[PDB]
Amino acid sequence: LETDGINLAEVMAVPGVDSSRTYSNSFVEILSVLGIEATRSSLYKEILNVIAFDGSYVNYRHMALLVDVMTSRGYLMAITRHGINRADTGALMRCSF
Amino acid sequence: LMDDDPVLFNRQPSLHKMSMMAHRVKVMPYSTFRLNLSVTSPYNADFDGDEMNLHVPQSEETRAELSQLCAVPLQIVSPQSNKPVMGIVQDTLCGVRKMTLRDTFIEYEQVMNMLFWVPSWDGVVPQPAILKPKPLWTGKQLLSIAIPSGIHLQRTDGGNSLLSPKDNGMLIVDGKVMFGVVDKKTVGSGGGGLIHTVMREKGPKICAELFGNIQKVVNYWLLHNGFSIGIGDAIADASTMKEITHAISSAKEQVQEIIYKAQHNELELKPGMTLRESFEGEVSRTLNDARDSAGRSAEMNLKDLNNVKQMVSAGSKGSFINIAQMSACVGQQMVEGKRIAFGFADRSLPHFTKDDFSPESKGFVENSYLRGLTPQEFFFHAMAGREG
Amino acid sequence: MNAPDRFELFILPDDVPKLKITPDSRVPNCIIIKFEREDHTLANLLREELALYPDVTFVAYKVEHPLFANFVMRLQTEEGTRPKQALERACASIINKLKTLDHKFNEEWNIKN
Amino acid sequence: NLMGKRVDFSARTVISGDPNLELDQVGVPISIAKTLSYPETVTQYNIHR
Amino acid sequence: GLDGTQVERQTIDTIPGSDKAFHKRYYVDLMDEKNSIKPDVIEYAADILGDVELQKELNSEYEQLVSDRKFLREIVFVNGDHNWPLPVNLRRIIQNAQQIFHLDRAKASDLTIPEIIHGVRDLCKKLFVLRGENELIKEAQQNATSLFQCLVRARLATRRILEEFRLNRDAFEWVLGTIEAQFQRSLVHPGEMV
Amino acid sequence: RHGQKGTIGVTYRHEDMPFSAEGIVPDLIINPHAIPSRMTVAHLIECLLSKVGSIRGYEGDATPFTDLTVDAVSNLLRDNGYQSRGFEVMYNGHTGKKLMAQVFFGPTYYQRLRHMVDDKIHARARGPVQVLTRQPVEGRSRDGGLRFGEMERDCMIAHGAAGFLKERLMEASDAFRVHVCGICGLMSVIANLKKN
Amino acid sequence: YVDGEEEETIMIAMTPEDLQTRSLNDTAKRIKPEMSTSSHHTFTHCEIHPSMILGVAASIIPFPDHNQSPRNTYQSAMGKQAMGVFLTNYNVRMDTMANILYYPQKPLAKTQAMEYLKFRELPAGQNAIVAIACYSGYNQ
Amino acid sequence: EPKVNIINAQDDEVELMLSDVNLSLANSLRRTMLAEVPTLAIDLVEIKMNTSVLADEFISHRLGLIPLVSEDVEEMKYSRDCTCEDYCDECSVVLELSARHEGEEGTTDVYSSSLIKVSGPGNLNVGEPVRRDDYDQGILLCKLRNHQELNIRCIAKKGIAKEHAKWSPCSAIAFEYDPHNKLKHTDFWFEVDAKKEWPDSKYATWEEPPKPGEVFDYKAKPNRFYMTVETTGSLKANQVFSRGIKTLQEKLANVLFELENSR
Amino acid sequence: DPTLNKTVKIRQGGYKGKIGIVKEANGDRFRVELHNPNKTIPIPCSF
Amino acid sequence: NTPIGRDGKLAKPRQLHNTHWGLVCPAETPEGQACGLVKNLSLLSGISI
Amino acid sequence: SALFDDIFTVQTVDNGRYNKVSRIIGISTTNSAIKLTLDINNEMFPVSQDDSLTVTLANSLSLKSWRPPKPTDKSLADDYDYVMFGTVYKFEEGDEDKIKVYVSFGGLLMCLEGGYKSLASLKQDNLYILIRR
Amino acid sequence: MIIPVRCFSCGKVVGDKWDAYLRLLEEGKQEGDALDELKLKRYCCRRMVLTHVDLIEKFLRYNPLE
RNA sequence: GCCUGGUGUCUUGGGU
Ligand SMILES: [Mg+2]
Ligand SMILES: [Zn+2]
Ligand SMILES: [Zn+2]
Ligand SMILES: [Zn+2]
């Protein structure tokens, strides 16, 4: 089955549903339900699907590198000023963005 | 500045690291920068007015950094997709398919020139494929001179046997082509092709000579064979057109049936879709399959000698859809992922009546570019084109 | 601004020899002849003539770049004959054929006059 | 001015293709070649040159 | 630990096929004569059959291959895909060895069985990504090359070395040295702005 | 007039061009690969129509949305002694040997655009600087220097050419020497170098 | 005269020939639409000529109905950059920049609308003899 | 052994068949006549007055293209090889032109027939602008209206077409061989039937068609080359063919000289 | 030097008979800005 | 000229709308930032006085 | 002085794909299950169906840099009409007596099928093929 | 601007045939026939005369600037 | 008798 809209926690508990394999394309919700390591795999799956769709192929290590940066703090750091410049990096580096 | 000084060469926008590679200067008359043609691809350069930038290192330390890290042969394989980003292109790629056809033969007098055109040639003329009644070499033998020894590559296209009736696949043993037309699948930029293989076995220096050797042989041979294209090559014969016209005529009838069913409540609803979405979806699938079917008919009728077919088959420019649109049917025009909208009240143009959902009303261009477009079709084509 | 002088196609600089012969010692009895300030016009004429001689085993030429009026010819002969001598023979043959050819045109021309 | 800036020893012009150049070569117009320069240090091995 | 320019799609041959086709390809039976190695490819064929001590190695070989296939099919590559980007392409290295040493011939090979099994097993300890004797490093070093070791063992299996590739003593020692040298060359270089 | 634009790649004198049997040589050779993916079929038809037009002596009417067909133009052309699709046998100029393929050949209207190379070529060794930044000035008309932008910076990082990047942005541009105080770290030092 | 608002309420035939029904099978020429959704049409107006939908720049293109649509846009831009003879009094005007082609020729393939744009009287280009061929590889 | 058969002839074009030679020799003769047969042509224009509507170098450019009688040019030296100080009578011809329109109405057309030879290497027949008849005004150079004057001095020099196309004595050179394609050097493009769709050569009746049974003679070579040399009147057609052969001889002779001197 | 910027005619070489102006006269080798093509040439003083 | 800007992406003022037929040219429009916003009157257009 | 010799009847001549090459299949008149598949140049050596062809395979024509043959010397090829030189690229040690030998003459391909006793000597690096009549 | 001296493509002189061409058009000959009478047989030469535009007649109308 | 300075801020139109 596939749904419009999400409620990952409640749907997992429903008898009949294989509770060990249910997947959502909102990784923000995955983080709240399954934790940071599951978010890593889900983030990778969603990026790869985008790139591979128009037949392109990017070697694993590049997409892997991007998602480790996005999950190293334990929460999702967006690639915007609100994420990037909340780091303990030097002021000259941060002000250049 | 003098011969063999390294300089950094660069075209904007610098989207990835092979936008900046080190080249060796050769001073020449006339005011343009000259590039060997096989580097146009990584720069995404062409010669329609593009400009490029050159930077000269100013010390002993940076000259060495350029030649040992940034130099062109080191950049042949890119880390982006573990495959080459440079291959044989355009004229040389079109020509190398023609030259390595099974029935290309070259007499002795021309063969001697071609061997001498290879800078890396060892001076040993190879024995002709035919000794009697007249010495004749095949194209595959002379191309093989440009490939260094010790190179083995095997590829199977469509489960071919070692007897290769269709002259497809590829087999290379000790740097000599046993069988197989050489096309985009072997000397293009694809992974696992010829260029990738020479790089692993021989290193970047030898692999850089491979580009130069192949180019000098093929462009000479192609100069004396010639190649052209004309208006004749877009024209399918009268028998094929009636097939073409029938498949489009029958597709317009099926679209009529769909309109009838949807208006008489006899149409199946697709999951997740309203009636009008389902209706619009089914019509679009029918019309795109109609053009592909008509395109397939036009393609198969074209003889092997037809010049449009030779470029499509080589992979050097063009694809199936281009044969289809020049000769058979331009097909459905799309805007914002949907058919042409009713920008007038309930109609697409003031030359139609309201509530007309037929193919011609909502942007199906029946004619080919050869035949010429009608005025209604023309505007719709300009709408789709503008969006691009 | 960077166009070269057009007269440089045929006028020889004083420090530049019209003709230069070097050996190709990698194989026996092979020379490289570099022709300065010449074209396909001269080169193709010599090449075919040479190829019909029985003692020439290899002859070829290339114009390496059309923006420079030169070409280089490679000539290998069998052990008996010396390549440079064979080139002289090819030259004299063609001068003779053109002398004959000029004569026969003159005769035919007066008849139509 | 700091993350990027204008620089000396640069040049720019229209490009053309040439099949009779090696892969790693670039043909450079004479006029450009007389304006750009490289500072070569004088040693015992090149002083005569 | 690898550089992106140095990998190519290679097939890992212990993943596809049925258990029967697998067993046909990899198993050596020194008891049942018709399921042993063909006699015309080895010189020492007489001293082979019946040897229980040589059968202990070949059993340990096949048991190792069974572990790999079970690990890869149930944990690593659940969907059965067996073509994957991997370092240093063994197929090309072998067919080059066939050319240098003219490895045509039915001339029975002088390459003994214990040289093969011990040769390959010793190779997998020299594929150094990280050096140092610390206990954690050795675990990390073994983990980094787990997939590649399976790839090597799937190719340099006893039956394939002898029946299919037909290597002799000179060529096989060369193949081991080349794999060892090229794997080192395929490591990413420190300082790379990845 | 069909969006098929190009720059001159080389020039050839009269006798090196390919020629037709009548001794007509082209003024200009464009590339066959420009046609199939761009699908400028009108360019070919214009060539065909203009061939007919120059033989019979009039300017063909090429207005869009008329009854003129390719076959009608082709019929006229064959009746004048030329192959009906516009092809002609041609001969290689270097050797005199025939080309194995025949070449589409005929008049086409070409237009000279304003972009000429001697209006674009530019080089700078050293030269004038801005008063404010002491960096090279902007623009061809002022002997300016090319911009080493943010994206070119990134490419040199990817190459790992750290030494080259340092030199470009200092010695080859606006390098300056300052004095600092080892205690307070400010550029407040007053340095008279002849008095030391 | 009709404007955009009144155009919404009228029914326009594309050419005079479409005003009357007809009695072909020429495999080269273009297919005319069937128009079988309405049984009988009641036309109120007719286009004077459909080629007048183009503007000044696009009217210089011979056969625009045979081109992929972006090429007509690209030529409409480039046409404004092509040297010709911008006026006949160039010797007495002192403009910042002016370009005059030495030997303008009128094109062998023209359109009817060019008569009024004066293009044959002030042409901007030359008829080159063109071979489409792969020659030395200096035209890739 | 080379044979020639002249099919037609007149002052400014010779049509001829060339036979029993190699393809390369026929082609080298074609190239030599276009590119290396010397002629005489204006190469320096001194404008003392030009008040016409045409730009100075525009008029000068047209002057360079005017064909001049070049019959005795072989005895004349190149300017670059003459031992003299500036020009003189041995290396140049001087021409002068002066036109003017008096009257407030009408247009004075300046024609190439107003070019007056002033000096020249007497008594060699060189330097007069070529004329068809005696009442032929010749080539249009300029047009003048009331008070506009053109007074120029032109220096004509010996040159070859390699330097600039104005020195070429030929126009087109028609050239073909093997009208029925017996050698199979071309592979014909066709839609339905190759023979009906390709026109016949204008020399189709000078050779016999291939017989319907006939096998392919893989030893046959090209052997008959029909060519027509048109000229601009700067040289007569018979002179161009003769001097083409002569010029090609000295070039080969010069190569032969250098080998016997380099030892 | 007394001959800079004065008009000059060339009496030997490939540019014999052409007008020019002395642009730079450092020593032995002059720089004449030729009138006829837009080029400034290096030339010896004997010419 | 339509004075909408360069601020505001989308497509609606830039698209060739159906009602442009016969009033502005379907082909003539600049490349780049002004694309689709600057238009040109068809040959037979007029403007009400 | 040769490695193989036999006479073949031509069963099929496939033109189709090319104008100058045809594929021929033949079976030995004297020994069935010995089959020959061979590409040949049409214009130089036209063959028809049911033609009898003597096919010899040698590893040398003597009774590295190719030279135009002198008219004075003499080789095995003086008595044949059509000679080709090629590379053996597959030696199939097949089932009971199914042996196939694949040779490439510059992309003109040959498959020779037959028995071990007839073809054991053909395990060579290079082969000439000589065709008579 | 004014009739070119030479055909661009082949070099045959055509600058002496412009006056003869205008006179033939007054006598009612068609363009193709007029070119035929002048012996301009190759179509490279024909384009030169058929498509030239004579602008110099317009520039002369601007009353001389001395 | 060596050194040797010619603007900026915008706007608009273009090129890839
Ligand atoms: Mg571009
Ligand atoms: Zn301080
Ligand atoms: Zn003199
Ligand atoms: Zn002409």
Automatic annotation (TrEMBL), chain B:
Subcellular location: Nucleus
Binding residues annotated for Mg(2+) 1, in chain numbering: D46, D48, D50
Annotated signal peptide: none
Binding sites annotated in the UniProt record for Mg(2+) 2: D48, D50
Binding positions for Mg(2+) 3 per the UniProt entry: D50
Family stated for the protein in its record: Belongs to the RNA polymerase beta' chain family.
Function recorded in the entry: DNA-dependent RNA polymerase catalyzes the transcription of DNA into RNA using the four ribonucleoside triphosphates as substrates.
Protein name (Swiss-Prot/TrEMBL): DNA-directed RNA polymerase subunit
Organism: Komagataella phaffii (strain GS115 / ATCC 20864)
Covered range of the whole protein: 437 to 824 of 1743
UniProtKB/TrEMBL annotation, chain C:
DNA-directed RNA polymerase RBP11-like dimerisation domain segment(s): 30-102
Pfam families for the chain: RNA_pol_L_2 (PF13656)
Cellular-component GO terms for this entry: RNA polymerase II, core complex
One example GO MF annotation: DNA binding
InterPro entries: RBP11 (IPR037685), RBP11-like (IPR036603), RBP11-like_dimer (IPR009025), RNA_pol_Rpb11_13-16kDa_CS (IPR008193), Rpo11-like (IPR022905)
Compartment list: Nucleus
UniProt-listed PROSITE patterns: RNA_POL_L_13KD
Any one Gene Ontology BP term: transcription initiation at RNA polymerase II promoter
Family: Belongs to the archaeal Rpo11/eukaryotic RPB11/RPC19 RNA polymerase subunit family.
HAMAP family noted in UniProt: RNApol_arch_Rpo11 (MF_00261)
Record's protein name: RNA polymerase II subunit B12.5
Species per Swiss-Prot/TrEMBL record: Komagataella phaffii (strain GS115 / ATCC 20864) (Yeast)
Automatic annotation (TrEMBL), chain J:
Domain RNA polymerase Rpb2: 1-45
Coiled-coil ranges (or none): none
Subcellular location field: Nucleus
Highest rank taxon of the organism: Eukaryota
Functional summary from the UniProt entry: DNA-dependent RNA polymerase catalyzes the transcription of DNA into RNA using the four ribonucleoside triphosphates as substrates.
Family of the protein in this entry: Belongs to the RNA polymerase beta chain family.
Subunit structure, as described in the record: Component of the RNA polymerase II (Pol II) complex consisting of 12 subunits.
Protein known as: DNA-directed RNA polymerase subunit beta
Source organism (scientific name): Komagataella phaffii (strain GS115 / ATCC 20864) (Yeast)
Upper classification of the organism: Eukaryota, Fungi, Dikarya, Ascomycota, Saccharomycotina
Parent-protein start and end of this portion: 492 to 540 of 1227
TrEMBL record, chain L:
Superkingdom of this protein's organism: Eukaryota
Pfam family, any one: RNA_pol_N
Signal peptide interval: none
Cellular localization per UniProt: Nucleus
PROSITE patterns in the cross-refs: RNA_POL_N_8KD
A molecular function (GO) term: DNA-directed RNA polymerase activity
Keyword rRNA-binding listed: no
GO BP of this protein: transcription by RNA polymerase I; transcription by RNA polymerase II; tRNA transcription by RNA polymerase III
Keyword Ligase: no
Ligand binding (Zn(2+)): C7, C10, C44, C45
Keywords: DNA-directed RNA polymerase, Metal-binding, Transcription, Zinc
This protein's GO CC annotations: RNA polymerase I complex; RNA polymerase II, core complex; RNA polymerase III complex
Family statement: Belongs to the archaeal Rpo10/eukaryotic RPB10 RNA polymerase subunit family.
Protein's name in the database: DNA-directed RNA polymerases I, II, and III subunit RPABC5
Protein source organism: Komagataella phaffii (strain GS115 / ATCC 20864) (Yeast)
